[PDB]
């Protein structure tokens, strides 16, 4: 069952083993139960840690209900996949990914004062192809000022660094003007909407670009796995797959009392049930009660 | 889908588009009788004007029924399509059973015949291993968990290089 | 037996969700 804090995340999500648990919880509440006390505790590190480890339990089955658009004609199945992942991030408690990684940027370098360590401490979160170019243009403005560039904003060296890194950003191909005018806003709602109708266009191009990069990586990895697999004779393939399946089955059956092991074994029995149900009536598929 | 929809018996489709099934409706004042004719089947119903808005009160919410996962089914679909692409070029192999007669055996250099019979055994090996379709269910499970860990990011599942680059421009070019 | 249910069949089967639940159950009381 659930422990009164996992069930507060599973309300808006639509994955099956969360929806059936929420439905059994409401079956408990309608049939004469009181709601347990929500904890007014757990100081901020434990709060964001349990957010990190509780949104994981609602995102990780959400990826498996999302089918990859591997090798399809048109960029619109990539838009389907990225929209599904956006909806999964929305139902997982994450924000828009732009403002989410902006929040991570602010969280990472709250204690950085110069601009070289703001490019050092956010090395894991930005592209190294872009981090190398930003470090080299910062070494250029460092050769200009002959002083460490300060990460304050009102410094003239940082102003020249901003006017050079905007050219670096257009050199990467992404327009910094529509993005800065989006997050800086305008007076009237009409010239804010005219900026948003460019920023959302770039935003769609950006998320479909990295989603298409992801499905191209899975396409090439599946092609490499198949081409390393087709070079084997069939008895070696059957022995390797049966031995790997038996070993990872022994790894589950060894864990006695573990909940994940019991769920693993029940899903194995459900897979065998699916094989039996397609074996009984293969004209229509599995037997589903309706 | 939203809970309130706004469609039905207004800008509705008026007729058929295929030769497999026929349909024509009755656009009367208050009511509507459909007449759908499909070969050996015949159906003519009488529906009301508000009988189409009560249709979308309950939602269907169609869902997949997958053996392992919908993601695993998509990866197994791509492995089946790649096995189709390899099977299309094991289908253009030249027929070598026509050169098994003994009038090709004894006119041949012996090592060339050794090479030819070993090439035939190699083709039978390649064809037995490209049509092992039971093994795609365990080939797909080696692509799954690294992908599922990549989508289990600490910032956002749909995150990528370009959106992080754009937000780094937004973080850097503003006043700290 | 056969023809079990619909939401019992909609479950993404070999997703983790429980190993993460195991580590989140044995981590948070050990860190509070």
């Amino acid at each position: 069952a659930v422990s009164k804090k996992e069930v507060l995340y599973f309300l808006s999500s639509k994955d099956a083993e969360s929806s059936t648990a929420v439905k059994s919880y409401l079956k408990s509440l309608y049939a004469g139960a009181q709601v347990e006390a929500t904890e007014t505790d757990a100081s901020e590190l434990i709060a964001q840690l349990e957010k990190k480890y509780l949104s994981a339990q609602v995102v990780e089955p959400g990826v498996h209900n999302i089918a990859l658009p591997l090798g399809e004609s048109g960029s619109a199945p990539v838009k389907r996949y990225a929209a599904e992942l956006f909806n999964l991030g929305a139902q997982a408690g994450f924000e828009c990914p732009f403002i989410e990684v902006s929040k991570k940027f602010g969280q990472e370098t709250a204690t950085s004062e110069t601009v070289k360590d703001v490019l050092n401490k956010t090395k894991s979160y930005v592209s190294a192809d872009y981090n190398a170019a930003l470090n080299e243009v910062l070494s250029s403005v460092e050769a200009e000022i002959n002083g460490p560039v300060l990460f304050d904003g009102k410094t003239e060296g940082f102003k020249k660094f901003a006017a050079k890194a905007k050219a670096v950003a257009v050199s990467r191909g992404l327009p910094a003007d529509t993005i800065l005018a989006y997050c800086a806003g305008s007076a009237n709602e009409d010239a804010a909407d005219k900026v948003s109708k460019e920023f959302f266009t770039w935003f769609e191009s950006a998320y479909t670009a990295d989603a298409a990069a992801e499905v191209k990586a899975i396409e090439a990895e599946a092609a490499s796995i198949l081409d390393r697999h087709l070079a084997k004779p069939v008895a070696q393939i059957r022995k390797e797959q049966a031995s790997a399946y038996a070993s990872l089955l022994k790894r589950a059956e060894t864990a006695k009392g573990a909940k994940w092991a019991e769920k693993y074994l029940e899903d194995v029995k459900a897979v065998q049930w699916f094989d039996a149900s397609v074996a009984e009536a293969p004209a229509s598929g599995p037997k589903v009660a309706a | 889908l939203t809970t309130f929809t706004f469609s039905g018996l207004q800008d509705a489709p008026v007729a058929a588009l295929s030769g497999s099934i026929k349909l024509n409706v009755a656009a009367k004042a208050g009511k509507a009788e459909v007449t759908v004719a499909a070969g050996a089947a015949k159906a003519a119903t009488q529906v009301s004007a508000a009988a189409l808005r009560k249709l979308s009160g309950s939602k269907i919410s169609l869902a997949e029924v997958a053996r392992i996962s919908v993601l695993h089914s998509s990866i197994q679909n791509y492995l089946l399509s790649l096995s189709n692409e390899r099977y299309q070029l094991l289908s253009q192999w030249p027929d070598f059973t026509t050169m098994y007669g003994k009038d090709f055996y004894y006119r041949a250099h012996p090592e060339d015949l050794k090479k030819f019979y070993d090439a035939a055994d190699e083709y039978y090996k390649l064809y037995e291993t490209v049509t092992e379709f039971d093994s795609l269910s365990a080939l797909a499970s080696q692509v799954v968990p690294n992908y599922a860990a990549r989508r289990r990011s600490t910032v956002h599942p749909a995150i990528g290089s370009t959106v992080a680059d754009g937000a780094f421009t937004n973080f850097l070019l503003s006043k700290q | 037996a056969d023809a079990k249910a619909l939401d019992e069949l909609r479950k993404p089967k070999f997703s983790s969700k429980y190993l993460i639940q195991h580590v989140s159950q044995k981590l948070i009381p050990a860190v509070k």
């Binding site: 990069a213 992801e214 191209k216 090439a220 399946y245 | 860990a149 990549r150 289990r152 | -």
Partner: peptide, 30 residues
């Protein structure tokens, strides 16, 4: 068909490492 279960996070946002194209089509045409 069953995969090993992992519970770990990726904090890095990198390119997804598009792997090498293997030479099976050219070997089979050869």
């Amino acid at each position: 068909y069953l995969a090993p279960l992992r519970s770990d996070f990726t904090e890095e946002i990198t390119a997804p490492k598009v792997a090498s194209a293997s030479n099976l089509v050219n070997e089979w045409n050869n």
